[PDB]
Amino acid sequence: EADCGLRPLFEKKSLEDKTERELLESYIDGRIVEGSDAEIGMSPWQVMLFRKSPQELLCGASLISDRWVLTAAHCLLYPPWDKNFTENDLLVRIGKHSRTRYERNIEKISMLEKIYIHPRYNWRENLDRDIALMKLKKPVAFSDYIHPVCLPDRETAASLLQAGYKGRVTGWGNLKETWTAPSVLQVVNLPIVERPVCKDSTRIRITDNMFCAGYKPDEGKRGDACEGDAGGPFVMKSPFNNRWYQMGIVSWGEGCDRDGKYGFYTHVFRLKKWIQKVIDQFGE
Ligand SMILES: C[C@@H]1CNc2c(cccc2S(=O)(=O)N[C@@H](CCCNC(=N)N)C(=O)N2CC[C@@H](C)C[C@@H]2C(=O)O)C1
């Protein structure tokens, strides 16, 4: 996308969201709290993936063009639970801040033309390459509240996706609500963890198409990956062109809020080839 990574209400407008300068600095602070209410238009690529019959929220996602939504394959397909949603079992709302409040002339809704899951998406073991692209029927117009997010390049992925560096999840606590055995848009900034540690922390076979984020718990923080939503986006603001890049789809995890457990994600850049191939050779 020629226009992405720049929020209409922020970067385009010289203003900067309260908690962002702790992302560029990747500098951790003296606070127990981590996530709270997210401000108006703080993430204009956030997409609400819905089930049709009955009506319910499934996953979060991301607008990348006026045509393509990006998400975790699991949201659409999981045969251990015979979960196979077709194009017309699902819909999307964009520009939503309040979970239960229609903002007039502001929020949009759309049905899907087609669904594209990854071919060697290993849903049989560890949800390898948990990625999926959704094409829209009627295309959406970018306003102040709807804007596409950027995709990483080789320089950005090498320079940003390292341990200690920080990223950000946004959602509506779907996850938290689903596995607690909540209202307006949530934002919680998490740091990237060492792949040596990611492995170490889980009994489950991980791949390079996967990375983890969270806090090692000898530095007691209340920063949990469950305040967002499944299939949601992981984003990191680049200090080389101000642009916000999506780095990892919220993939999977063990339990939720606990010491020395981290949210694993799809390695977006590592699959940059696939995503782009379908936009270049299928839509428009
Ligand atoms: C290979 C994975 C391993 N784990 C699981 C699987 C399936 C069902 C439930 C689990 S869970 O209990 O460990 N945890 C849930 C919820 C925890 C969310 N953690 C995060 N920090 N993201 C989960 O990972 N998943 C991912 C797979 C889907 C199918 C169910 C469920 C979810 O709703 O996100 C398959």
UniProtKB/Swiss-Prot annotation:
Changing residue 263 to V: In FA2D; Quick-2. Disulfide bonds join 4-150, 59-75, 198-212, 226-256. Changing residue 48 to T: In FA2D; Himi-1. This is Thrombin heavy chain. It comes from Homo sapiens. Residues 213-235 are annotated as: High affinity receptor-binding region which is also known as the TP508 peptide. Glycans are attached at residue 84. Changing residue 129 to W: In FA2D; Tokushima. The chain holds residues 333 to 622 of 622 of the full protein. The active site is at 74 (charge relay system), 130 (charge relay system), 230 (charge relay system). Residues 32-280 form the Peptidase S1 domain. The record marks 31-32 as: Cleavage.
